[PDB]
Design a binder for these strands. Sequence first.
DNA 1: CTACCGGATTGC
DNA 2: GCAATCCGGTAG
Length: 210
Amino acid sequence: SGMACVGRTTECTIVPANHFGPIPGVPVGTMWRFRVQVSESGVHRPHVAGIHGRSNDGAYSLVLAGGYEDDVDNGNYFTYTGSGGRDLSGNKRTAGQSSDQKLTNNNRALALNCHSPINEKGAEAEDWRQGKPVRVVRNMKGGKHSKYAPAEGNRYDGIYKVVKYWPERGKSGFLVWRYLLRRDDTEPEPWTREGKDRTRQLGLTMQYPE
DNA sequence: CTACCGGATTGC
DNA sequence: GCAATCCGGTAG
């Protein structure tokens, strides 16, 4: 079973589970081979889910991992897809779209980060930088369609904010919730010349399980 | 390609 | 507390 059914070896105690913003001691460019490690770091606590959020508070983090065809990654911004609209019966974790997504649970959480009152028809923020921060991790499985994904594993790419969100018919013909995320982070983007230099100057290397 | 498990977390 | 959810990971 390797890493398929494993739990954490430690938990992040440096900040609590509902911390908004960067995790202390984890710079942009930090890299981990497996999602469980990303969880142990505090950067993205769920081992499987794309969004970490509480539907009455906000979303703390998300992962771009190519798991949702409606995702569109443009590096310094991206269009993210809500979760759900899927039949996971039979103890699945992933499936194709087979019903309309809903503005509930993780999807409502991420909408709350937008600097606009929550709205079932979607919203746009007049001052997007006042929104709640989202920690963004890119996983190599996004690399099928995105040149910004890391070659392997998972990489912390910094703080993004939700500019707007809206419902739209997805590629599979069912409604999906879509979110425009835009970067708001003083640290360089890992894929740029400056980001590559920073990663090197910091001595960051891929973290593997102990 | 197909099938489906633990664990972590939030929903209720 | 128990139910629901799930952008992972592996075996066949």
